[PDB]
Ligand binder design. Structure first.
Ligand code: CLA
Ligand code: CLA
Ligand code: CLA
Ligand code: CLA
Ligand code: CLA
Ligand code: CLA
Ligand code: CLA
Ligand code: CLA
Ligand code: CLA
Ligand SMILES: CC1=C(/C=C/C(C)=C/C=C/C(C)=C/C=C/C=C(C)/C=C/C=C(C)/C=C/C2=C(C)CCCC2(C)C)C(C)(C)CCC1
Ligand code: SF4
Lengths: 80, 99, 64, 731, 192, 31, 165, 35
């Protein structure tokens, strides 16, 4: 239950969506960049908070931005 | 150290006359510039502190120059403080002079 | 006609949230399509992520 | 799973975190769900009532225990040859030898010897018997009950005050300056004159006969006739015996200065006159602001006119009134800064100018009181800066505070941080370098190659106060100068007599060792301030995290990206600065303790020669003075200092434990706990018991808090044990 | 302007139309208009008070009635200060009170007036009708004499605080042998 | 003259009453 | 005397310390043939100690209650008492040498910044250029004051990057 | 001192009875599930 947002500085490089290990980020058609694609975070219920997505964004400042918040079993990464 | 009566009475009457005749224009000008205190742009009364409502016995007086009773009390307090400074200091008999 | 700064000129960054705020960089291209940020600027010095190329708009890329 | 009633986010947590964070966020009302400004202010007001009830109950408990289990009546007769008793000990683990070893100050059973100095205070203010202590305890118990009832009363919608009542700052300042400060000290003067002064001269004045005793033989006529000097006619003789009537005198408002020869404390008439002057001044100051009577000041207009021309300050203080008034963390930081600095003031004055009878005579009490108030002040200063950081993260509005001194000081924060960095680097480099140089040249058997700078500036200031030891002959040390001629008939006789005598702590002599230690103190203050100021200013955002205010005051990190962002929040700046505050206050207390331990034994030379190199500190202070402390219990028995030896090792254990949380981080522990969870769900006879909360390792910020709390508690306990056992052992 | 205190130099532009202006403002204390207006009023009033003060300090000594420093001493440690050789039957308390009342009245009337009438109020303060015939020149003379008298009063204070003499006594002492009893010979002004 | 037993008992009883006031205020704050 | 400190050449404790330290070294001597390498080393050490104690007494350093030299860190109160070699003169000497090294480094940075690979000329120093600038750094007071009076020493903050407040 | 028996009763109350009861009540309340 972390709040993942994607801002318009995105250039659609697909790095953030290959980085994510839990499939929270996705590519959708867009038009505000040359690649004509932007990222989106529909499955944000699955966000663990690893910030691998945020560590792969080349834009300055970062386009994918994670805000850790409420903790659930999915967010806390509990196998037991 | 010569008559509490004369010094305190003369000092208080002089201070009253000095705050009614001499310092009153500047006092009123500064009071008009300052005005009632405001929080976030509104007086404490508008914000909801109905105890910050201005006392009614000062808004309208009968002194032709607007000298209210609270002004009288402030100026009399200053006069008594100065008079008792005079008394208590003249009562001492020690060399404070740095010479 | 061509829009924005010329290719190869030096510009001063004016985005307050950028690593190179108030520092100079050379334009390597300006896209003409209609992107929000078409100006592409190259700096000598890298940022914390190790990159040196960034895209800026046109109101925040004062030349010279 | 509904314990955190105030936080729905934490209630739904399926783990043990819900408990931990559910405790640590119980008082942050602004973060609670469904919270309005009105409700916040009302809840805060009631919490303050609860706090005063706690304080009154604590002081009533002290009084009751001294009256019940203490030897106050015995201590009054022989204030110098009796050890004040705190409370009795009832512990069923004690062996017989410990019961033997803890029966001390004449009591029938094992007891604790008080190091709080409350005996001296109550003795000085007029309390002589235990019935008076019991009466005070009962009165304070009732008073705490009354404050509790008021706190409940004002939580009620019939009596709940509106929010605009709380923000009324002019009326609150008027009443706190004139009423809470002025009239309270006026009444303290009334007590001193009516009770403490006559009880200091053998006469008994109590509730029974205070209306039949004249505090002055010509009562109230000099006061109303202006003949005020008649209240300082014959003061206390230099041969006065406290508590008795041997050369007592009739003056009630004297201004002698200096010390009482027997008690080695301030004259009581001096303090009575002090509080009279303070009362008059504070009442006058309390008539400054405007309420509802059409006179006074509007603080907003004062702030709006403190804008210098030429625009050196920018918009001046435009918008500071609303900024302070609206933000409760700004007010809390200001109050904490003031209270902490005043705690340091209390510590620094009460040893050089002891105010209580037969204080300073007792040595463990002096050290205990000084170290206590110094540590309290250090913690309060860290809190003031933490709440400044919280103000910036939470309640700072750039649009309202645009162009005022707050915006201008945020504008050039890099200058501030870089110059604090330079000052701290300089002080550290050079103080360490001089210490190491002295230490090496001493190690090679040539102590004459030592760099021993003389503190000529501090020695010069000491000489300006009348200390005729450095031959400066400057201001008050020149019996011919204007300040000397002015005070030579009022206060200067006693003051100069006290300052020029080496029998007290009033302005100790200082050499090169004092120079080195003061520069160590300067390094500590500057580095602690660097950490705190940097974390307060670099709290709305850095170059590394330009949107930090979007995350709040406390958060773990920002992932391992951009090189790594551990300890990036402002809370982590407070965390890192707590260590430096501990270290700096430790230096201050080490310096004070060694200086005075040399003073009290007459051996000033040990400090004056051994304090210029660090092995002198390690050997002639820590190692030498720890002999009696660590010998409290040993295979040959134990003595009264066994409790302090156990506490010494206990503090060592706590501090060493805190390193575990400080060094190891959440990630080894999570896997370890998770293997343990596999072990428990999976073993016979224990599958019948399952956890209601999923056991998870402590969070990152929580673990930092836990390690820091252990560190601080261990630090405090270890030094307190060493101090008490090293001072009470020798004296 | 007429003058330039540092001949080869450039003067601030806000100091031109003012009477007795020399461009003397190396600290930029008049960079703002309202500040400069207040400073101009204060300079003129200070000049007047210091002319009166310097005239008094010189005229109590040239007339022969003690120096300015020892004039208030007799009022303390005794009483009845002397004027022209006479003796006022007033103590320090009544002197302070009467001065406070009179000065309060006078300077409260002055302070409540218009900006220009706070510094150059002819009216009844120019009985000899001299403000006419272009007072600009007269204002310059007043300002320059005031500057000289202000510097003289500060000189009285400092010379008495350093050598402990009296104005005419210091004058005579310096005149007797200037090359060896100037300010460079006392042990105060020069820390040598 | 040490304080008598009845004084100790009166003090303890009044402390119990004060504790009752305290618990009332505490539950008011929890609300 | 400047603050209750008698000159070490007068202080009895200073001479007593001299005596005791020399006596310790003599006791160490009384174990070797006065012609062996250890004996020569001990004799040289004693000569060095005596020279140091005489040198300190000659220069008029101030000794305290104990026999240890003290220093004065106030210009004026050290210049009118003949003790400017304690802190003021070494202050000048340091400030000069520190400024020399700092100015040499600063000018080397500004000289290699305007090259092809400035990040390369910091890990592989150009020794002739470094040595030339190290020689030019000796006049650093002159050149630095020239650049301050010129305004070319410093940079206006409108061009230095800052954090987002 | 007076009432020598009183500590022997009050100390176990506050160091054993009160802590156990308070901890039991607190652990029941934090797990009350519906307050
Ligand atoms: C409620 C506040 C209050 C008020 C209204 C007054 C009013 C007065 N006081 Mg009082 N006083 C007060 C508080 C107050 N006082 C307090 C708190 C103190 C203690 C410090 C005193 C001590 C005091 C003394 C000692 C005297 C007065 C005197 C007087 C009278 C002098 C008036 C006058 O014109 O003198 C006379 C005018 C000329 C001499 C001309 C006057 C009616 C004086 C008095 O009684 O008058 C004879 C006087 O002797 N007051
Ligand atoms: C005469 C009127 C009056 C008085 C007496 C008080 C008194 C008090 N108010 Mg209050 N208040 C008032 C008017 C008044 N108020 C008005 C008109 C308003 C509306 C504008 C408010 C609004 C208000 C609020 C919102 C709050 C208070 C609070 C408090 C309490 C302050 C906390 C405290 O006890 O520390 C006491 C402080 C001192 C005694 C001064 C200490 C001086 C320094 C720190 C130390 C110096 C002393 C000395 C060196 C120490 C040596 C002693 C040692 C030997 C033991 C206090 C009892 C707070 C509170 O606690 O809630 C109950 C609080 O929240 N007031
Ligand atoms: C607020 C503290 C306080 C209180 C409650 C008292 C109370 C008392 N004093 Mg005392 N006193 C005090 C402070 C105080 N005093 C101080 C600070 C000093 C000087 C250091 C003295 C010196 C003193 C002397 C020398 C004598 C007393 C005496 C007395 C008793 C006779 C009543 C009286 O004085 O005549 C009545 C008072 C008046 C007619 C005028 C007083 C009104 C004043 C000027 C203004 C009141 C405003 C004030 C700020 C209100 C504060 C509120 C506060 C009381 C809660 C009385 C029980 C006399 C006595 O008989 O001993 C038993 C006695 O001779 N006092
Ligand atoms: C008038 C004093 C005062 C007040 C009213 C507040 C009020 C507040 N502070 Mg604060 N603070 C203060 C002083 C004060 N502080 C000081 C002096 C410091 C320096 C240490 C701090 C540092 C500080 C920080 C870093 C933070 C706050 C926060 C807060 C807010 C929430 C508090 C909370 O989370 O509760 C919870 C209370 C606890 C978790 C208690 C923790 C346990 C303590 C620290 C140690 C226990 C060990 C124990 C003593 C050992 C027993 C001894 C024995 C074994 C030997 C709150 C509005 C928080 C905040 O504002 O959120 C942004 C925040 O993060 N404060
Ligand atoms: C003995 C332990 C220790 C020491 C020596 C220091 C020293 C220092 N701390 Mg630190 N600190 C410590 C513990 C320590 N800390 C702990 C436990 C914490 C909690 C985590 C902190 C948290 C902390 C913070 C948050 C900050 C500091 C800062 C600083 C620097 C302050 C500036 C200064 O004083 O300049 C003096 C310099 C010295 C004393 C270093 C000595 C110089 C060396 C020894 C000379 C080199 C000789 C030789 C060539 C060495 C190499 C030989 C080898 C390679 C063979 C300083 C270097 C502040 C800072 O960064 O400064 C701007 C900073 O903000 N500290
Ligand atoms: C004095 C400081 C201290 C202490 C007490 C501990 C203690 C412990 N560490 Mg630790 N550690 C420390 C410092 C310390 N460490 C530091 C500085 C680091 C950084 C390198 C680490 C890094 C570290 C790692 C990586 C690991 C540990 C582990 C452990 C646990 C191993 C289990 C054990 O030892 O058996 C028993 C525990 C004790 C003997 C502790 C003392 C308790 C007393 C003797 C008995 C308890 C009864 C008590 C007194 C009664 C309760 C009182 C009541 C009021 C509650 C243990 C609790 C390991 C672990 O988690 O388990 C395998 C683990 O892998 N530590
Ligand atoms: C950096 C801090 C500092 C401090 C604390 C002092 C302190 C002192 N200096 Mg000093 N001084 C300083 C810097 C400092 N100086 C510097 C940087 C210089 C070089 C410009 C001097 C040059 C200097 C001289 C020439 C003299 C002093 C003297 C003095 C002493 C007399 C001061 C006095 O009479 O009232 C202070 C007056 C004020 C206006 C303040 C005093 C102890 C005098 C002295 O030696 O006394 C024996 C003396 O003549 N100083
Ligand atoms: C020639 C290079 C150079 C220069 C001109 C400066 C200049 C400055 N530094 Mg800096 N610094 C340097 C190198 C340099 N530094 C290096 C290599 C480091 C990494 C250790 C630092 C780390 C550093 C810190 C942490 C701080 C400064 C600060 C400062 C300022 C305060 C002055 C000071 O005492 O700093 C102190 C100097 C040091 C701590 C170390 C100096 C390093 C050596 C001695 C110099 C390097 C010379 C170079 C290797 C030789 C090249 C010669 C050429 C011929 C090849 C100042 C403007 C302070 C500041 O913030 O400004 C107020 C500050 O806190 N510096
Ligand atoms: C808050 C101050 C305070 C403190 C720290 C102590 C501490 C202590 N008391 Mg004591 N007590 C106090 C106030 C205090 N008391 C007051 C005001 C009274 C008057 C009624 C008493 C009457 C009293 C008696 C008769 C006895 C003790 C005893 C003891 C000792 C054992 C504790 C115990 O089991 O007794 C239990 C204590 C009580 C039953 C009543 C104390 C109630 C206080 C006010 C609690 C206040 C709560 C506190 C402020 C907030 C902390 C949070 C907490 C609720 C979790 C212990 C050292 C016993 C002893 O002598 O041991 C040898 C003993 O028999 N006390
Ligand atoms: C962060 C922050 C904050 C906080 C801050 C702080 C905490 C501060 C502080 C600080 C401090 C804590 C300070 C202190 C101070 C003090 C001072 C500065 C002083 C002084 C004094 C003087 C000057 C003196 C004088 C004198 C002398 C010399 C001696 C004798 C007497 C006399 C008086 C004469 C706030 C929120 C607010 C804001 C924002 C953020
Ligand atoms: S190590 Fe811990 S604190 Fe550091 S970046 Fe990784 S998760 Fe954050």
């Amino acid at each position: 239950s972390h709040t993942v947002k994607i801002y318009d500085t995105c250039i659609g490089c697909t790095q953030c969506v290959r980085a994510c290990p839990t499939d929270v980020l996705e590519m959708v058609p867009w038009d505000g960049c040359k690649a004509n694609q932007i990222a989106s975070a529909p499955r944000t219920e699955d966000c663990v908070g690893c910030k691998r997505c945020e560590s792969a964004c080349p834009t300055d400042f970062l386009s994918v931005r994670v805000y850790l918040g409420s903790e659930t079993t999915r967010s806390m990464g509990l196998a037991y | 150290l010569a008559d509490v009566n004369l010094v305190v009475g003369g000092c208080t009457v002089g201070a009253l006359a000095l705050g009614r005749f001499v310092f009153l224009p500047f006092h009123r000008a500064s009071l008009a510039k300052a005005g009632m205190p405001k929080q976030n742009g509104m007086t404490h009364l508008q914000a909801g502190d109905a105890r910050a409502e201005e006392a009614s016995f000062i808004l309208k007086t009968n002194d032709p120059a607007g000298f209210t009773v609270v002004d009288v009390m402030a100026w009399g307090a200053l006069g008594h403080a100065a008079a008792f400074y005079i008394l208590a200091t003249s009562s001492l008999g020690l060399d404070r002079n740095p010479f | 006609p061509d829009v924005g700064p010329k290719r190869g000129t030096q510009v001063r960054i004016l985005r307050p949230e950028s690593y190179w705020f108030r520092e100079t960089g050379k334009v390597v291209s300006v896209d003409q399509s209609g992107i929000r940020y078409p100006v592409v600027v190259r700096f000598e010095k890298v940022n914390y992520a190790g990159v040196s190329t960034n895209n800026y708009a046109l109101d925040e890329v004062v030349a010279a | 799973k509904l314990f955190p009633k105030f936080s729905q986010a934490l209630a739904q947590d399926p783990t043990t975190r819900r408990i931990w964070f559910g405790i640590a966020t119980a008082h942050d009302f602004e973060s609670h769900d469904g919270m309005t400004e009105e409700r916040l202010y009302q809840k805060i007001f009631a919490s303050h009532f609860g706090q005063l009830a706690i304080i009154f109950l604590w002081t009533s408990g002290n009084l009751f225990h001294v009256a019940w289990q203490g030897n106050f009546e015995q201590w009054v007769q022989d204030p110098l040859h009796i050890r004040p008793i705190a409370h009795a000990i009832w512990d069923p683990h004690f062996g017989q030898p410990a019961v033997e070893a803890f029966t001390r100050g004449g009591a029938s059973g094992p007891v604790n010897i008080s190091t709080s100095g409350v005996y001296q205070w109550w003795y000085t203010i007029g309390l002589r018997t235990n019935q008076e202590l019991y009466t005070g305890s009962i009165f304070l118990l009732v008073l705490a009950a009354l404050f509790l009832f008021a706190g409940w009363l004002h939580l009620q919608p019939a009596f709940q005050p509106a929010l605009s009542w709380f923000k009324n700052a002019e009326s609150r300042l008027n009443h706190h300056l004139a009423g809470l400060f002025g009239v309270s000290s006026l009444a303290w003067t009334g007590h001193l004159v009516h009770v403490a002064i006559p009880e200091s001269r053998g006469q008994h004045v109590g509730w029974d006969n205070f209306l039949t005793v004249l505090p002055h033989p010509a009562g109230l006529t000099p006061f109303f006739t202006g003949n005020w000097a008649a209240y300082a006619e014959n003061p206390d003789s230099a041969s006065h015996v406290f508590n008795t009537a041997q050369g007592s005198g009739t003056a009630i408002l004297t201004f002698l200065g200096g010390f009482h020869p027997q008690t080695q404390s301030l004259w009581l008439t001096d303090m009575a006159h002090h509080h009279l002057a303070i009362a008059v001044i504070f009442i006058l100051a309390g008539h400054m602001y405007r309420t509802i009577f059409g006179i006074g000041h509007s603080m907003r207009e004062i702030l709006e006119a403190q804008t210098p021309p030429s625009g050196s300050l920018g918009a001046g203080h435009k918008g500071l009134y609303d900024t302070v008034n609206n933000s409760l963390h700004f007010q809390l930081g200001l109050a904490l800064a003031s209270v902490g600095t005043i705690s340091s003031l209390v510590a620094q004055h009460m040893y050089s100018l002891p105010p209580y009878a037969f204080l300073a005579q007792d040595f463990t009490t002096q050290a205990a009181l000084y170290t206590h108030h110094q540590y309290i002040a250090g913690f309060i200063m860290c809190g003031a800066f933490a709440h400044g950081a919280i103000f910036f993260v939470r309640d700072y509005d750039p649009a309202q505070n645009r162009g005022n001194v707050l915006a201008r000081i945020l504008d050039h924060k890099e200058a501030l941080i870089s110059h604090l960095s330079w000052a701290s680097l300089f002080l550290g480099f050079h103080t360490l370098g001089l210490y190491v140089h002295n230490d090496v040249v001493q190690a090679f058997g040539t102590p004459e190659k030592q760099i021993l700078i003389e503190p000529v500036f501090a020695q010069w200031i000491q000489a300006a106060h009348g200390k005729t030891a450095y031959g400066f002959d400057f201001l008050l040390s020149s019996a011919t100068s204007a300040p000397s001629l002015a005070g030579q008939a009022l206060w200067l006789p006693g003051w100069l007599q006290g300052i020029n005598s080496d029998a007290n702590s009033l302005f100790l002599t200082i050499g090169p060792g004092d120079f080195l230690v003061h520069h160590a103190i300067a390094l500590g203050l500057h580095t602690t301030t660097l950490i705190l100021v940097k974390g307060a200013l670099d709290a709305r955002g850095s170059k590394l995290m330009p949107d930090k205010k979007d995350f709040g005051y406390s958060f773990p990190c920002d992932g391992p990206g951009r090189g790594g962002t551990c300890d990036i929040s402002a809370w982590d700046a407070f965390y890192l600065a707590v260590f430096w505050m501990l270290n700096t206050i430790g230096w201050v207390t080490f310096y004070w303790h060694w200086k005075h331990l040399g003073i009290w034994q007459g051996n000033v030379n040990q400090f004056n020669e051994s304090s210029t190199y660090l092995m002198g500190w390690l050997r002639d202070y820590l190692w030498l003075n720890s002999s009696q402390l660590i010998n409290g219990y040993n295979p040959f028995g134990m003595n009264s200092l066994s409790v302090w030896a156990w506490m010494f090792l206990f503090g060592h254990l706590i501090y060493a434990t805190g390193f575990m949380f400080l060094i190891s981080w959440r990630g080894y522990w999570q896997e370890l706990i998770e293997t343990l969870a596999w072990a428990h769900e999976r073993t016979p006879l224990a599958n019948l018991v399952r956890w209601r909360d999923k056991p998870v390792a402590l969070s990152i910020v929580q673990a930092r808090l836990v390690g820091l709390t252990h560190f601080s508690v261990g630090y405090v306990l270890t030094y307190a044990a060493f101090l008490i056992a090293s001072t009470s052992g020798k004296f | 302007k007429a003058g330039n205190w540092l001949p080869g130099s450039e003067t601030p532009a806000y100091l031109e139309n003012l009477p007795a202006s020399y461009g003397f403002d190396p600290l930029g204390l008049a960079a703002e208009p309202a500040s400069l207006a207040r400073f101009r009023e204060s300079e003129v009033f200070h000049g007047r008070w210091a002319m009166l003060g310097a005239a008094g300090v010189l005229g109590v000594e040239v007339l022969g009635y003690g120096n300015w420093y020892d004039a208030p001493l007799p009022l303390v440690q005794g009483g009845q200060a002397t004027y022209f050789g006479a003796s006022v039957p007033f103590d320090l308390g009544t002197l302070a009170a009467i001065e406070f009342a009179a000065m309060a009245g006078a300077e409260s009337f002055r302070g409540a007036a218009e900006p220009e009438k706070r510094v150059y109020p002819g009216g009844a303060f120019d009985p000899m009708g001299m403000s006419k015939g272009n007072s600009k020149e007269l204002k310059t003379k007043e300002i320059k004499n005031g500057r000289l008298a202000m510097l003289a009063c500060l000189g009285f204070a400092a010379q008495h605080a350093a050598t402990g003499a009296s104005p005419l006594e210091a004058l005579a002492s310096h005149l007797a042998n200037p090359m060896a009893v100037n300010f460079a010979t006392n042990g105060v002004s020069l820390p040598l | 003259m040490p304080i008598a037993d009845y004084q100790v008992f009166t003090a303890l009883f009044l402390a119990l009453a004060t504790g009752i006031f305290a618990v009332r205020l505490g539950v008011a704050l929890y609300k | 005397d400047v603050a209750g400190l008698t000159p070490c050449s007068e202080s009895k404790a200073f001479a007593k310390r001299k005596k005791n330290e020399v006596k310790a070294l003599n006791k160490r001597l009384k174990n070797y043939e006065a012609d062996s390498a250890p004996a020569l080393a001990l004799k040289a050490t004693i000569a060095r100690t005596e020279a140091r104690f005489d040198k300190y007494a000659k220069q008029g350093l101030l000794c305290g209650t104990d026999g240890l030299p003290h220093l004065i860190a106030d210009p004026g109160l050290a210049l009118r008492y003949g003790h400017a070699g304690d802190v003021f003169i070494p202050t000048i000497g340091f400030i000069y040498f520190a400024g020399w090294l700092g100015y040499a480094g600063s000018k080397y940075l500004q000289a290699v910044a305007a090259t092809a690979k400035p990040i390369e000329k910091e890990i592989i120093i150009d020794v002739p250029l470094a040595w030339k600038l190290l020689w030019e750094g000796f006049g650093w007071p002159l050149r630095a004051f020239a650049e301050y009076k010129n305004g070319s020493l410093m940079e206006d903050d409108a061009k230095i990057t800052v954090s987002p407040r | 001192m007076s009432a020598q028996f009183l500590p022997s009763i009050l100390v176990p109350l506050v160091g054993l009875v009160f802590p156990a009861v308070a901890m039991a009540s607190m652990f029941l309340y934090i797990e009350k599930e519906e307050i």
